[PDB]
Design an enzyme around this catalytic site. Structure first.
Site, PDB file in Angstrom:
ATOM      1  N   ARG A  42       0.146  -2.162  -7.787  1.00 19.40           N
ATOM      2  CA  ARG A  42       1.463  -2.674  -8.129  1.00 19.40           C
ATOM      3  C   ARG A  42       2.349  -2.600  -6.900  1.00 19.40           C
ATOM      4  NH1 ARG A  42       6.021  -0.188  -9.317  1.00 19.40           N
ATOM      5  NH2 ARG A  42       5.030   1.819  -9.822  1.00 19.40           N
ATOM      6  N   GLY A  43       2.992  -3.721  -6.577  1.00 24.76           N
ATOM      7  CA  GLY A  43       3.974  -3.770  -5.520  1.00 24.76           C
ATOM      8  C   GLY A  43       5.387  -3.823  -6.077  1.00 24.76           C
ATOM      9  N   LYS A  44       6.348  -3.848  -5.152  1.00 24.97           N
ATOM     10  CA  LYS A  44       7.745  -3.975  -5.550  1.00 24.97           C
ATOM     11  C   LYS A  44       7.953  -5.226  -6.390  1.00 24.97           C
ATOM     12  CE  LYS A  44       8.909  -2.241  -0.924  1.00 24.97           C
ATOM     13  NZ  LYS A  44       8.836  -0.799  -1.286  1.00 24.97           N
ATOM     14  N   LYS A  63      -2.190 -11.704  -9.456  1.00 25.44           N
ATOM     15  CA  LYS A  63      -1.028 -11.016  -8.982  1.00 25.44           C
ATOM     16  C   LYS A  63       0.097 -11.564  -9.804  1.00 25.44           C
ATOM     17  CE  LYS A  63       1.623 -10.618  -4.885  1.00 25.44           C
ATOM     18  NZ  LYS A  63       1.474 -10.873  -3.470  1.00 25.44           N
ATOM     19  N   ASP A 151       3.348  -8.248   7.050  1.00 27.79           N
ATOM     20  CA  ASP A 151       3.037  -7.045   6.356  1.00 27.79           C
ATOM     21  C   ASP A 151       1.624  -6.703   6.596  1.00 27.79           C
ATOM     22  OD1 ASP A 151       3.553  -4.855   4.907  1.00 27.79           O
ATOM     23  OD2 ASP A 151       3.215  -5.885   3.005  1.00 27.79           O
TER      24      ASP A 151
HETATM   25  C1  LIG Z   1      -7.868  -3.967  -4.785  1.00 27.05           C
HETATM   26  C2  LIG Z   1      -7.491  -3.257  -3.461  1.00 27.05           C
HETATM   27  N1  LIG Z   1      -5.992  -3.197  -3.171  1.00 27.05           N
HETATM   28  C3  LIG Z   1      -5.801  -2.286  -1.966  1.00 27.05           C
HETATM   29  C4  LIG Z   1      -4.331  -2.002  -1.624  1.00 27.05           C
HETATM   30  C5  LIG Z   1      -5.386  -4.576  -2.923  1.00 27.05           C
HETATM   31  C6  LIG Z   1      -4.672  -5.155  -4.145  1.00 27.05           C
HETATM   32  N2  LIG Z   1      -4.078  -6.433  -3.923  1.00 27.05           N
HETATM   33  C7  LIG Z   1      -2.765  -6.717  -3.774  1.00 27.05           C
HETATM   34  C8  LIG Z   1      -2.603  -8.070  -3.584  1.00 27.05           C
HETATM   35  C9  LIG Z   1      -3.881  -8.637  -3.611  1.00 27.05           C
HETATM   36  C10 LIG Z   1      -4.780  -7.596  -3.816  1.00 27.05           C
HETATM   37  C11 LIG Z   1      -6.141  -8.059  -3.837  1.00 27.05           C
HETATM   38  C12 LIG Z   1      -7.357  -7.443  -4.002  1.00 27.05           C
HETATM   39  C13 LIG Z   1      -8.531  -8.218  -3.979  1.00 27.05           C
HETATM   40  C14 LIG Z   1      -8.475  -9.582  -3.784  1.00 27.05           C
HETATM   41  C15 LIG Z   1      -7.254 -10.193  -3.614  1.00 27.05           C
HETATM   42  C16 LIG Z   1      -6.102  -9.447  -3.649  1.00 27.05           C
HETATM   43  C17 LIG Z   1      -4.668  -9.854  -3.505  1.00 27.05           C
HETATM   44  O1  LIG Z   1      -4.309 -10.993  -3.311  1.00 27.05           O
HETATM   45  C18 LIG Z   1      -1.288  -8.619  -3.410  1.00 27.05           C
HETATM   46  O2  LIG Z   1      -1.086  -9.777  -3.168  1.00 27.05           O
HETATM   47  C19 LIG Z   1      -0.091  -7.698  -3.552  1.00 27.05           C
HETATM   48  C20 LIG Z   1      -0.391  -6.279  -3.157  1.00 27.05           C
HETATM   49  C21 LIG Z   1      -1.648  -5.768  -3.831  1.00 27.05           C
END
Ligand SMILES: CCN(CC)CCn1c2c(c3c1-c1ccccc1C3=O)C(=O)CCC2
Ligand SMILES: [Cl-]
Length: 328
Positions: A42-44, A63, A151
């Site tokens: 979860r982000g902001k 997302k 970022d």
């Molecule tokens: C699943 C691993 N977490 C590690 C921090 C990533 C989670 N996470 C995010 C995003 C995306 C992911 C993510 C994981 C796997 C494939 C594609 C994506 C994304 O696009 C965002 O955009 C917003 C921030 C969180």
């Protein structure tokens, strides 16, 4: 002022629609095609789920975007759509809405991310080169597409270390680079904020990402993760200055006519530029090579304009083993 050394005209040379994300009208598909399977984070401004597209069983990441102004959504969407097919940029599979609430969500390709905290302590030298190169591909791509990610940080660099697959994710802070545009310095994540952000220099550019990448590289090769571990944005710069040097910081500030937030007076201290070799220890020695340090030195430069571009970084000998392995 300041201008990206590369890709400074990407957007201006493109149709306005390319970069005028506020005018972008996503085609919002139906989120009902997606079954959320598990929260990934979860982000902001969003929550992220592993999801299955129930129509084709495709595992994706959904997302779900929080009630921010649709401007930032359009921005991310447009950026993602502009970056579609970009190497190692997370693939936006679709932009969907809950058909009732109209809450938008972005559907991304799924990556089985290897936890970076653990991954970064086990990367081999080649892995670092490889992944940095992969990440650079994404950054060079997005920069070449006129987009700063803003970022870059391990959390946004999904590495499936099993498939050696890297995706730069979370384009929610990404922006189009327009020369002379003053950007919000409240981007990137503290440890990866370029000095430009930390000194509130708004006329930054893609090179911010290269700082962040440099920070990642540093953390990978040195295994100090994060490498510059500021307790806050002020201390972040202090941490940087403790490595890059305060006189060098001042030269940077001087060059860009940046005056420090006076709060820095009582915290920057006086620090000589540290040799990057200072960060070598027995446990990271095998990840550090002259080429890594040279690359790092050329990324972690105050002067964002003198940092390597992603392409320059990719061209750096540090990645020759990767390129060589890529070809052979
Ligand atoms: C699943 C691993 N977490 C590690 C921090 C990533 C989670 N996470 C995010 C995003 C995306 C992911 C993510 C994981 C796997 C494939 C594609 C994506 C994304 O696009 C965002 O955009 C917003 C921030 C969180
Ligand atoms: Cl901005």
């Amino acid at each position: 002022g300041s201008r990206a050394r590369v890709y400074a005209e990407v957007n201006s040379l493109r149709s306005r629609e390319y970069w005028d994300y506020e005018a972008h009208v996503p085609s919002w598909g139906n989120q009902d095609d997606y079954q959320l399977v598990r929260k990934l984070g979860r982000g902001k401004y969003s929550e992220v789920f592993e999801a299955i597209n129930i129509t084709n069983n495709e595992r994706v990441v959904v997302k779900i975007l929080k009630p921010v102004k649709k401007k930032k959504i359009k921005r991310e969407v447009k950026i993602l759509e502009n970056l579609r097919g970009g190497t190692n940029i997370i693939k936006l599979i679709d932009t969907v809405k809950d058909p009732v609430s109209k809450t938008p969500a972005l559907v991304f390709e799924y990556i089985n991310n290897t936890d970076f905290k653990q991954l970064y302590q086990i990367l081999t030298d080649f892995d670092i080169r490889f992944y940095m190169y992969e990440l650079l591909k994404a950054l060079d791509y997005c920069h070449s597409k006129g987009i700063m990610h803003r970022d870059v940080k391990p959390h946004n660099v999904m590495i499936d270390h099993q498939q050696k697959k890297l995706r730069l994710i979370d384009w929610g802070l990404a922006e189009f680079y327009h020369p002379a545009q003053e950007y919000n310095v409240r981007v990137a994540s503290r440890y990866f904020k370029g000095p430009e952000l930390l000194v509130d220099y708004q006329m930054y550019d893609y090179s911010l990402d290269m700082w962040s990448l440099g920070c990642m590289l540093a953390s990978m090769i040195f295994r100090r993760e994060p490498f510059f571990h500021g307790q806050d944005n002020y201390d972040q710069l202090v941490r940087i200055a403790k490595v890059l040097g305060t006189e060098e910081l001042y030269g940077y500030l001087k060059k860009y006519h940046i005056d420090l937030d006076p709060h820095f007076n009582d915290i920057l201290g006086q620090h000589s530029r540290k040799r990057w070799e200072n960060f070598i220890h027995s446990e990271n020695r095998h990840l550090v090579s002259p080429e890594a340090l040279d690359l790092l030195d050329k990324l972690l430069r105050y002067d964002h304009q003198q940092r390597l571009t992603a392409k320059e970084a990719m061209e750096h000998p540090y990645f020759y083993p990767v390129v060589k392995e890529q070809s052979q």
